Design a protein around this ligand. Sequence first.
Ligand SMILES: [Zn+2]
Lengths: 105, 526, 100, 216
Amino acid sequence: REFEPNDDGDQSFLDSPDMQTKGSENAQILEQVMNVHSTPPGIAESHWLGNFELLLLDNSGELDNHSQVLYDQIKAHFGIDSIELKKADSLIRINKMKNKLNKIR
Amino acid sequence: GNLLSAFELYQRNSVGEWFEMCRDYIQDGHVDESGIFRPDNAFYLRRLTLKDFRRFSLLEIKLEEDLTVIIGNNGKGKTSILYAIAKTLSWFVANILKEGGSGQRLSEMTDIKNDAEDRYSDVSSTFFFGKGLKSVPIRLSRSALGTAERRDSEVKPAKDLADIWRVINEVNTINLPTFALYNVERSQPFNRNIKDNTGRREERFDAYSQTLGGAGRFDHFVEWYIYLHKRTVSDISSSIKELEQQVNDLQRTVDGGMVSVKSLLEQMKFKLSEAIERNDAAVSSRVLTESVQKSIVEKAICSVVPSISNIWVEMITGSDLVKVTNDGHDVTIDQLSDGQRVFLSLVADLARRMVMLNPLLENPLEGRGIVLIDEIELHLHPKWQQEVILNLRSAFPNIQFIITTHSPIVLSTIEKRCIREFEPNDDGDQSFLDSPDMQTKGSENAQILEQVMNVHSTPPGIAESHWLGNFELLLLDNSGELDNHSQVLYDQIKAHFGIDSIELKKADSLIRINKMKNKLNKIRAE
Amino acid sequence: SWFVANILKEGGSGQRLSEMTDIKNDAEDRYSDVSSTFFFGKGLKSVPIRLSRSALGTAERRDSEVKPAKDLADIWRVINEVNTINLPTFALYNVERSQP
Amino acid sequence: MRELARLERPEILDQYIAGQNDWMEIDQSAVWPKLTEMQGGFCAYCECRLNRCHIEHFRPRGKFPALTFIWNNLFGSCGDSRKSGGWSRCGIYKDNGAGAYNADDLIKPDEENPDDYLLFLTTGEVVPAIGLTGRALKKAQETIRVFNLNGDIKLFGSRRTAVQAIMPNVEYLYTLLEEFDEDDWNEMLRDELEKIESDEYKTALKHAWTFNQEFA
Ligand SMILES: [Zn+2]
């Protein structure tokens, strides 16, 4: 049983949630039934991959001095085996092939 | 230069140069580009060592200048470290208050390791106080009864520093440091009958009272706070000119020379002179007016606690009470929930002592000291656990903190250099404390439980948890092609988790890649 | 608490609501009520109870209604004095369980 | 927001006179057959499946009562008020949370193309398109704010998770174009875009696979 998103003390009757909880993933429950993000929005380093994707798309999928400098921050902070670095590499590859196929067209 | 040389030349020889050099070294500092005051000489602890204590043979620890955190699942091991630090700080507090004096000591029937053939135990420490006084060592010791020799403590270097602070302050006022401990015992009920009254909670040195006891005195805060109201509401300098009436105008009509009636005049004239002597004595220090003292505390309490937006004192039928506005409605202190009361009981006690000890600053909360806290998250829901560290560290810019926890959400907010990992061998013992491999600051929670704490993301004791993994093996054996054994799993997943759920979206992806794009490429290439 | 007191003695008494804290701070009527309903098989389908209290300085009082609970407690106690039977369990565990 | 198209009205809209009849006098069971043929079972703004729903007047009834029976002023939308709740996106938030809003500053899905204004990032965020200027920019900004398209945590978490599940498939193809013939590699892509018309949050899935407004 749970309360509504906002209530002054005037809700008349209680109800159950929508999703199935029995055996589900921990990171889904915290976001779907408790209303909290998966990483802390007040920490500056948590936003860097969104800036990197946008900055690479602006220059038509080519790297430049600015985006190279940003890529070096991520590598130095999170380290050589990190999920963040493994994820950033995939964006560079598939975008390069997407640009090549356009040039053939 | 050397602070101990300047104090030696001053003391002896009785001088103005040697006195002035001692007072400047303590008081100099500057304002940062963000508008924060920073002193020229910092004070903090650097190292700790333990020998034959309780279950430890020999152990060493290195501490950070800003923030340190201890982690691991053994509770008595972690608790024994904070107990050893709090014994050592008691020797500074005793020497600031009075000449001579004494701290606490080790216990012969509990603290010595049960089977060490040396039959004695030691605890050792080292502090720093800027470029002119870069090391101050201390040792505490004891031994079993009936031995051929004896071990004593060594404390003279600690007494010497505390005497400089006490002697200079009696000639011309200075700021002083803070020391405190908050334990698991802080969570207890509140007594609403505050009938007790006494005249002692109004002196600069009551700030050191009970300060290492483990819980704080929230009953003393309520007595102090309503006293500021009754003196700011009507200016007490009026009572001097009111007493001056009978004192000045009975004089001309105390006829007949009678000893009884003229003693009544002598008593009021005496009493008025002893009253004015306190108004004179208060000018000997830069004591802030009660209107400014009251104003500073109310902004601090309201800024740190998430749900409180106002606080005040008011008079009922026959006594004063404290009120707050909480979630937009008005209530008394005994109507708050336990998670709200216990966290306010911490912030109010620490804020009073700092406004009493630092009268010469512009913002009293920017002073120096050391603070110890035990379980940091207690009665707090997940949303507050993401922001408690940033709120405290924004409010008190120059204090050093040492803390304990086991929540993964709190660790997402700190740098890996601040972390010390505790992992005893069998029957106890370790030689050193380590730090983890992965970066914690700004990482996702599902990785921290796996890599820093060794626990899975789904309950292993529930049958429904496993069967998405079994489907992948059935799809692989017959080389990425469906059969009845795959179909019964696919229907059971869809029946329990529902149609739009992530389990079914993920299962559909396996079929759609491992059939067409794999099979057609291999068959065509053949 | 009104069941337990009547298993131990004939004509027992339970706990009360507070005058000073439990009534809502800004309600116009200045009184409060709590109501419940229990079940005991197809031969006794419903059992009602009501607890109430009125604020200080008010001119008229609300009244509690507790008779149906006394009638069910009496049959458990009286039958046991002639021959032995099994009895119900009631308990509460609070946050004060943690204190030394 | 996919591009919608409007077809002929349902005759029952001719049966009532504005200001004489209250909008409560319509049989709502008669009109859902025409709002469905066009929308296909999904919300007009946030693109998710519909299980609890209502019909929304695009230009409000209060301010403009003359439009109460105009067929171009209706759309099908998610959530309800007869079943109660604290719902916080689409047409309920447009009244109760947005505050003030100019009706001409918002994009409408059947007389403009949202592809001229909006971009979806692989992290799950929605952003104004690259190279915009002041008049186009304010349309993109107010449309994102008034419908709360980045602020409902249930919407943000679901959309992010849906895109992140397809990425191992997207990299397997796009890396075999040296093995396949120049037309066979096109067919190996059409077989993907043909499914996506039947799933959720389609626009975000399209922005991962495609390479231009030119199809191949
Ligand atoms: Zn919607």
